Amino acid sequence: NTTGGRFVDKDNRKYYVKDDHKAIYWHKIDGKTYYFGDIGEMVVGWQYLEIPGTGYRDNLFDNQPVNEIGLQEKWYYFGQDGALLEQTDKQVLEAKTSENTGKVYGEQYPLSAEKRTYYFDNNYAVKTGWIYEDGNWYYLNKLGNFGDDSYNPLPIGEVAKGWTQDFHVTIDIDRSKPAPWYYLDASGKMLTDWQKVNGKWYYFGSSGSMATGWKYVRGKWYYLDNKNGDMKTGWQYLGNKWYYLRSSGAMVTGWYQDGLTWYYLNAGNGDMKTGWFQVNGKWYYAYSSGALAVNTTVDGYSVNYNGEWVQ
Ligand SMILES: C[N+](C)(C)CCO
Ligand SMILES: C[N+](C)(C)CCO
Ligand SMILES: C[N+](C)(C)CCO
Ligand SMILES: C[N+](C)(C)CCO
Ligand SMILES: C[N+](C)(C)CCO
Ligand SMILES: C[N+](C)(C)CCO
């Protein structure tokens, strides 16, 4: 807690001077918190700053050495008086834009008439990640917009919409950890179970993560694209074996007739069978294409209209 000082207005800026030295970075002054930057100019409004509390950026004055430290940056909101908004739940505030962030006391900037509901963590920074609100899950952006060299932290903390990947993020993305896919609706609601997006079907389960590969959902087997997740139908060559999935996407087992041709999908895994196989005591022969032989001979041996072997 900083004491023995005084706020001073000068040069269309504001400072906190004690013993004739300017205050810098974070300071607790009389039950309130302020951030005076690198040269002492008090900040107002939306600010993207290193997290306070470590002491490496706290209770410092312009006459002391500033230490090298690797601290994560986060969004904070200060009032027009310079006092930090110590909110830990939610609050409606002016939207974060390209022209109301990083301003100092004295600097006049347009007030965004657009107001948004921002959420805060227990340390007064804008919350990121998942949040539950009225029986639904929303995702607040963990990362800004990336570029070849450009990074815009402005979207951090905003309600995500559409296809969104959830990364493990501290200061940078952790590419060693998984990053599932989610879809937030036109109001940010996380989608669950089966959903049709852009004409194709996707399964999000009960947790919301997009499914990939084979998935057993309510007694049926489905195949979601191994990478893009969209549901497959019809004949599919997966794992060097053949499978037929209905228009509903449900895998087919047993006998199936495509037009006039008969195929047999193995009972267990539904893989198409070839060559000689036996169903309920009787024998059948299926060509390389999986098509069943009917009313013909196979190596001299005869099969009737049902494909059954007739001694
Ligand atoms: C992703 N949710 C927040 C919906 C559940 C935690 O896995
Ligand atoms: C649906 N995904 C976003 C997972 C892939 C399409 O780009
Ligand atoms: C399971 N789906 C919703 C994808 C199809 C139902 O016919
Ligand atoms: C996932 N299936 C069971 C459908 C095939 C693998 O055995
Ligand atoms: C079973 N195949 C997919 C090989 C042919 C039927 O279209
Ligand atoms: C074996 N088939 C399915 C082709 C006919 C049974 O009656």
Coordinates of C-alpha atoms and ligand atoms in Angstrom, one line a residue:
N1 CA 0.0 0.0 0.0
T2 CA 1.4 3.3 -1.1
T3 CA 1.1 6.4 1.2
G4 CA 2.9 9.6 1.8
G5 CA 2.2 11.0 -1.6
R6 CA -0.2 13.2 -3.6
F7 CA -1.9 13.2 -7.0
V8 CA -0.6 16.0 -9.3
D9 CA -2.2 17.3 -12.5
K10 CA 0.3 18.7 -15.0
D11 CA 0.7 18.8 -18.8
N12 CA -2.8 17.5 -19.4
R13 CA -1.8 14.3 -17.5
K14 CA -2.0 13.0 -13.9
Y15 CA 0.7 11.7 -11.7
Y16 CA 1.3 10.4 -8.1
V17 CA 4.4 12.1 -6.7
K18 CA 6.0 11.0 -3.4
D19 CA 9.3 12.5 -2.1
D20 CA 9.5 14.1 -5.6
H21 CA 9.5 10.8 -7.5
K22 CA 6.7 9.7 -9.9
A23 CA 4.9 6.4 -9.3
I24 CA 4.9 3.8 -12.0
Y25 CA 2.9 0.6 -12.8
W26 CA 0.5 -0.7 -10.1
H27 CA -0.1 1.1 -6.8
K28 CA -2.6 0.6 -4.0
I29 CA -3.5 4.1 -2.8
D30 CA -6.1 4.5 0.0
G31 CA -8.2 1.5 -0.7
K32 CA -8.0 1.8 -4.5
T33 CA -5.7 0.5 -7.2
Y34 CA -4.1 2.6 -10.0
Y35 CA -1.7 1.9 -12.9
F36 CA 0.7 4.7 -13.9
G37 CA 2.5 3.1 -16.8
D38 CA 6.2 3.3 -17.5
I39 CA 6.6 7.1 -17.2
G40 CA 3.9 7.9 -14.6
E41 CA 0.9 9.0 -16.6
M42 CA -2.3 7.6 -15.0
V43 CA -4.3 5.3 -17.2
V44 CA -8.1 5.3 -17.7
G45 CA -10.5 3.0 -19.5
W46 CA -9.7 -0.3 -21.1
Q47 CA -6.1 -1.4 -20.5
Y48 CA -4.0 -4.5 -21.5
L49 CA -1.4 -4.8 -18.7
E50 CA 0.8 -7.3 -17.0
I51 CA -0.9 -9.0 -14.1
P52 CA -0.4 -7.1 -10.8
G53 CA 0.5 -8.5 -7.3
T54 CA 3.9 -10.0 -7.9
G55 CA 5.8 -7.0 -6.6
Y56 CA 8.0 -6.9 -9.7
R57 CA 5.5 -4.3 -11.1
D58 CA 4.0 -3.0 -7.9
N59 CA 4.8 -0.2 -5.4
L60 CA 7.5 1.1 -7.8
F61 CA 8.7 4.7 -8.4
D62 CA 10.5 6.2 -11.3
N63 CA 13.7 6.4 -9.3
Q64 CA 14.1 2.6 -8.9
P65 CA 15.3 -0.2 -11.2
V66 CA 12.6 -2.0 -13.2
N67 CA 13.2 -5.8 -13.2
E68 CA 13.1 -8.1 -16.2
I69 CA 10.0 -10.3 -15.6
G70 CA 7.8 -12.6 -17.7
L71 CA 4.3 -11.7 -16.7
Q72 CA 1.1 -12.5 -18.6
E73 CA -1.0 -9.6 -19.9
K74 CA -4.7 -9.3 -19.3
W75 CA -7.5 -6.9 -19.8
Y76 CA -8.6 -4.5 -17.1
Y77 CA -11.0 -1.6 -16.9
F78 CA -10.3 1.7 -15.1
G79 CA -12.8 4.4 -14.3
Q80 CA -12.4 8.0 -15.6
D81 CA -10.9 8.7 -12.2
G82 CA -8.1 6.1 -12.7
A83 CA -9.5 3.6 -10.1
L84 CA -9.5 0.0 -11.2
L85 CA -12.9 -1.7 -11.4
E86 CA -12.5 -4.5 -8.8
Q87 CA -15.3 -6.6 -10.3
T88 CA -15.3 -10.4 -9.9
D89 CA -18.6 -11.4 -11.5
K90 CA -20.0 -9.5 -14.5
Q91 CA -20.7 -5.9 -15.6
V92 CA -21.9 -4.1 -18.6
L93 CA -19.3 -1.7 -20.0
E94 CA -18.4 0.2 -23.1
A95 CA -17.2 -2.2 -25.8
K96 CA -13.5 -2.7 -26.3
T97 CA -12.6 -1.1 -29.6
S98 CA -9.5 0.2 -31.5
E99 CA -10.0 3.7 -30.1
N100 CA -10.9 3.3 -26.4
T101 CA -7.9 1.3 -25.2
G102 CA -4.6 2.4 -23.8
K103 CA -5.7 6.0 -23.1
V104 CA -4.3 8.1 -20.3
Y105 CA -6.0 10.6 -18.0
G106 CA -6.3 13.8 -20.0
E107 CA -6.5 12.1 -23.4
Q108 CA -10.1 12.4 -24.7
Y109 CA -11.5 9.5 -26.7
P110 CA -15.0 8.6 -28.1
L111 CA -17.2 6.6 -25.8
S112 CA -18.5 3.5 -27.7
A113 CA -22.3 3.7 -27.5
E114 CA -22.2 -0.1 -27.8
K115 CA -22.3 -1.7 -24.4
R116 CA -21.3 -5.4 -23.7
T117 CA -21.6 -7.7 -20.8
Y118 CA -18.0 -8.6 -19.7
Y119 CA -17.2 -11.3 -17.2
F120 CA -14.4 -11.0 -14.6
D121 CA -12.3 -13.5 -12.7
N122 CA -11.5 -13.3 -9.0
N123 CA -8.5 -11.0 -9.7
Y124 CA -10.3 -8.2 -11.6
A125 CA -9.1 -9.3 -15.0
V126 CA -11.5 -10.0 -17.9
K127 CA -12.4 -13.7 -17.7
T128 CA -11.5 -16.0 -20.6
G129 CA -12.5 -19.6 -21.3
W130 CA -15.7 -21.3 -20.4
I131 CA -18.6 -19.8 -18.4
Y132 CA -22.0 -21.1 -17.4
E133 CA -25.0 -18.8 -17.6
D134 CA -28.7 -19.8 -17.3
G135 CA -28.3 -23.4 -18.3
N136 CA -26.0 -22.8 -21.2
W137 CA -22.2 -22.8 -21.8
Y138 CA -20.5 -19.8 -23.4
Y139 CA -16.8 -19.5 -24.5
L140 CA -15.0 -16.2 -24.0
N141 CA -12.0 -15.9 -26.4
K142 CA -8.7 -16.9 -24.8
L143 CA -6.6 -15.6 -27.8
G144 CA -6.7 -12.6 -30.0
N145 CA -6.4 -12.5 -33.8
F146 CA -3.1 -13.8 -35.1
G147 CA -1.2 -12.7 -38.2
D148 CA 2.2 -13.2 -40.0
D149 CA 3.6 -11.0 -37.2
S150 CA 0.5 -9.2 -36.0
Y151 CA -1.4 -10.0 -32.8
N152 CA -4.6 -8.2 -31.8
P153 CA -5.5 -8.8 -28.2
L154 CA -8.8 -6.9 -28.7
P155 CA -11.0 -10.1 -29.1
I156 CA -9.8 -11.5 -25.8
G157 CA -12.7 -12.0 -23.4
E158 CA -15.5 -11.6 -26.0
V159 CA -18.3 -14.1 -26.6
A160 CA -17.2 -16.5 -29.3
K161 CA -19.5 -17.5 -32.1
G162 CA -19.2 -20.2 -34.7
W163 CA -16.6 -22.9 -35.1
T164 CA -14.1 -22.3 -32.3
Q165 CA -11.1 -24.3 -31.1
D166 CA -10.3 -24.5 -27.4
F167 CA -6.5 -24.4 -26.9
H168 CA -4.5 -24.7 -23.8
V169 CA -3.2 -21.1 -23.5
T170 CA -0.9 -19.3 -21.0
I171 CA 1.2 -16.7 -22.8
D172 CA 1.2 -18.7 -26.0
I173 CA -0.7 -21.7 -27.4
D174 CA 0.4 -25.1 -26.0
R175 CA 0.6 -27.2 -29.2
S176 CA 1.5 -30.3 -27.2
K177 CA -2.0 -30.5 -25.7
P178 CA -5.3 -31.3 -27.4
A179 CA -7.5 -28.6 -28.8
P180 CA -11.1 -29.8 -29.5
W181 CA -13.6 -28.1 -31.7
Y182 CA -16.9 -26.5 -30.6
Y183 CA -19.7 -24.6 -32.2
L184 CA -21.4 -21.6 -30.5
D185 CA -24.7 -20.5 -31.8
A186 CA -25.9 -17.0 -32.9
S187 CA -26.0 -16.1 -29.2
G188 CA -22.9 -17.9 -28.0
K189 CA -24.7 -21.0 -26.7
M190 CA -22.6 -24.2 -27.0
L191 CA -24.2 -26.9 -29.1
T192 CA -24.6 -30.5 -28.0
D193 CA -25.7 -33.8 -29.6
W194 CA -26.4 -33.9 -33.3
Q195 CA -26.4 -30.6 -35.2
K196 CA -26.6 -29.7 -38.9
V197 CA -24.1 -27.0 -39.8
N198 CA -23.6 -25.9 -43.5
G199 CA -25.6 -28.8 -44.8
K200 CA -23.6 -31.5 -43.1
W201 CA -24.2 -33.3 -39.8
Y202 CA -21.9 -33.2 -36.7
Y203 CA -22.1 -34.8 -33.3
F204 CA -21.1 -32.7 -30.3
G205 CA -22.1 -35.1 -27.5
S206 CA -22.9 -33.9 -24.0
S207 CA -19.6 -32.0 -23.4
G208 CA -19.8 -30.1 -26.7
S209 CA -16.6 -31.3 -28.3
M210 CA -16.8 -32.3 -32.0
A211 CA -16.5 -36.0 -32.5
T212 CA -14.1 -37.6 -35.0
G213 CA -14.0 -41.2 -36.3
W214 CA -16.3 -44.0 -35.2
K215 CA -18.8 -43.1 -32.5
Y216 CA -21.5 -45.2 -30.8
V217 CA -24.6 -42.9 -30.3
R218 CA -27.8 -44.5 -28.9
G219 CA -27.3 -48.0 -30.1
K220 CA -26.0 -47.2 -33.6
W221 CA -22.5 -46.8 -35.1
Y222 CA -21.6 -43.6 -37.0
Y223 CA -18.4 -42.4 -38.7
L224 CA -17.4 -38.8 -38.4
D225 CA -14.6 -37.6 -40.7
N226 CA -11.3 -38.2 -39.0
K227 CA -10.4 -34.5 -39.2
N228 CA -13.3 -32.3 -40.3
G229 CA -15.9 -34.3 -38.3
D230 CA -18.8 -34.2 -40.8
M231 CA -20.9 -37.4 -40.9
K232 CA -20.4 -39.9 -43.7
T233 CA -23.1 -41.9 -45.6
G234 CA -23.2 -44.6 -48.2
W235 CA -20.2 -46.8 -48.9
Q236 CA -17.0 -45.9 -47.1
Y237 CA -13.5 -47.4 -47.4
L238 CA -12.1 -47.0 -43.9
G239 CA -9.3 -49.1 -42.5
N240 CA -8.8 -51.0 -45.8
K241 CA -12.3 -52.5 -45.3
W242 CA -15.7 -51.5 -46.7
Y243 CA -18.8 -50.3 -44.8
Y244 CA -22.2 -49.1 -45.8
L245 CA -23.8 -46.3 -43.7
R246 CA -27.5 -45.4 -44.3
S247 CA -28.7 -41.9 -45.2
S248 CA -29.2 -41.5 -41.4
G249 CA -25.5 -42.3 -41.1
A250 CA -26.2 -45.4 -39.1
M251 CA -23.9 -48.3 -39.9
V252 CA -25.6 -51.3 -41.5
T253 CA -25.1 -55.0 -40.4
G254 CA -26.2 -58.2 -42.0
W255 CA -27.7 -58.4 -45.5
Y256 CA -28.1 -55.2 -47.5
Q257 CA -29.3 -54.9 -51.1
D258 CA -28.0 -52.0 -53.3
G259 CA -30.3 -52.2 -56.2
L260 CA -30.2 -55.8 -57.4
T261 CA -26.9 -56.7 -55.7
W262 CA -26.6 -58.3 -52.3
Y263 CA -23.8 -57.6 -49.8
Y264 CA -23.2 -58.9 -46.3
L265 CA -21.8 -56.6 -43.6
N266 CA -20.2 -58.6 -40.8
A267 CA -22.4 -58.8 -37.7
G268 CA -19.8 -57.4 -35.3
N269 CA -17.8 -54.5 -36.9
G270 CA -20.0 -54.2 -40.1
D271 CA -17.1 -54.8 -42.5
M272 CA -18.1 -56.1 -45.9
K273 CA -17.3 -59.8 -46.4
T274 CA -15.7 -61.3 -49.4
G275 CA -15.1 -64.9 -50.6
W276 CA -16.8 -67.8 -48.9
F277 CA -18.8 -67.1 -45.7
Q278 CA -21.5 -68.9 -43.8
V279 CA -24.7 -67.4 -42.5
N280 CA -27.1 -69.5 -40.4
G281 CA -25.6 -72.8 -41.5
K282 CA -25.8 -72.0 -45.2
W283 CA -22.8 -71.0 -47.4
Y284 CA -22.5 -68.0 -49.8
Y285 CA -19.8 -66.6 -52.1
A286 CA -19.2 -62.9 -52.5
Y287 CA -17.0 -61.5 -55.3
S288 CA -14.1 -59.1 -54.8
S289 CA -16.6 -56.1 -55.1
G290 CA -18.5 -57.7 -52.2
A291 CA -21.4 -58.6 -54.6
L292 CA -23.0 -61.9 -53.8
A293 CA -23.0 -64.6 -56.5
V294 CA -26.5 -65.7 -57.5
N295 CA -27.7 -68.3 -60.0
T296 CA -24.3 -69.2 -61.4
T297 CA -21.2 -71.3 -60.7
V298 CA -18.2 -70.6 -58.5
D299 CA -15.2 -72.8 -59.3
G300 CA -17.7 -75.4 -60.7
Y301 CA -20.0 -75.2 -57.7
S302 CA -23.6 -73.9 -58.1
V303 CA -25.4 -71.3 -56.1
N304 CA -29.2 -70.6 -56.4
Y305 CA -31.2 -67.4 -56.7
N306 CA -30.6 -66.8 -53.0
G307 CA -26.8 -67.2 -53.4
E308 CA -26.9 -70.4 -51.3
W309 CA -24.6 -73.2 -52.2
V310 CA -26.6 -76.1 -53.7
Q311 CA -24.7 -79.4 -53.4
Ligands
LIG1 C1 -16.6 -27.9 -22.1 N1 -17.5 -27.7 -21.0 C2 -17.2 -26.5 -20.3 C3 -18.9 -27.6 -21.5 C4 -17.5 -28.9 -20.1 C5 -16.1 -29.2 -19.5 O1 -15.4 -30.2 -20.2
LIG2 C1 -15.5 -28.3 -38.9 N1 -14.0 -28.0 -38.7 C2 -13.8 -26.6 -38.3 C3 -13.6 -28.9 -37.6 C4 -13.3 -28.3 -40.0 C5 -13.7 -27.5 -41.2 O1 -12.7 -26.5 -41.4
LIG3 C1 -28.7 -39.0 -36.6 N1 -28.9 -38.0 -37.5 C2 -29.6 -36.8 -36.8 C3 -27.7 -37.5 -38.1 C4 -29.9 -38.5 -38.6 C5 -31.2 -38.9 -38.2 O1 -32.0 -39.4 -39.3
LIG4 C1 -16.3 -49.1 -35.1 N1 -16.8 -50.4 -35.7 C2 -17.2 -51.3 -34.6 C3 -18.0 -50.1 -36.5 C4 -15.7 -51.0 -36.5 C5 -14.4 -51.3 -35.8 O1 -14.5 -52.7 -35.2
LIG5 C1 -19.1 -52.3 -52.2 N1 -18.5 -51.4 -53.2 C2 -18.4 -50.0 -52.5 C3 -17.1 -51.8 -53.4 C4 -19.3 -51.3 -54.5 C5 -20.7 -50.8 -54.3 O1 -20.8 -49.5 -54.8
LIG6 C1 -29.5 -64.3 -48.8 N1 -30.5 -63.3 -49.3 C2 -30.6 -62.2 -48.4 C3 -30.0 -62.9 -50.6 C4 -31.8 -64.0 -49.5 C5 -32.4 -64.7 -48.3 O1 -33.7 -65.1 -48.5

